[PDB]
Amino acid sequence: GGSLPSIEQMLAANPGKTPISLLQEYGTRIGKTPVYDLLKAEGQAHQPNFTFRVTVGDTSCTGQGPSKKAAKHKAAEVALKHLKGCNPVGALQELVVQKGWRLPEYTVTQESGPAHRKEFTMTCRVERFIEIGSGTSKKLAKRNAAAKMLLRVHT
RNA sequence: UUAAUUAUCUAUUCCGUACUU
């Protein structure tokens, strides 16, 4: 024995990872390697679209998204199935500036999460209002802190 | 040696919104 879990069980063993990384682990057991190809790269520089294809043995599938991370993610998940066979920060800036208040400021108040995934806690400050948010990135903690503050400063 | 993934920093290119002059 000592063999790896089934292709269904490995999904539940590491559901926090991308389907790309699970295909990279599964490929070695079957003697295949998931080859990744960029099928499309176009956009109006404001709403672009990308396409990825993945190849595993005698099978290949595609996926798309507004970024190469989202497009590769969709193409990878599709292979496992066959193998199993507006800005809140900007909206706040417009609100604070329209009411005649001073510009907002952002500062990190905490850090957590292991370095392979990370997390952050960010604070927002306004002329008299203050609020906090969190996320896997400083900008992502900022967008959350702004989203909660939009409820604080608005009616 | 090869493949896959997140975060931080720096540089380059493109695009949008608000405020001010």
Next chain:
RNA sequence: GUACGGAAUAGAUAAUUAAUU
């Protein structure tokens, strides 16, 4: 003049997984 967001490319740093030497 100031503030904010999105996509792509390059360099540096930290972390995680699989295969191989």
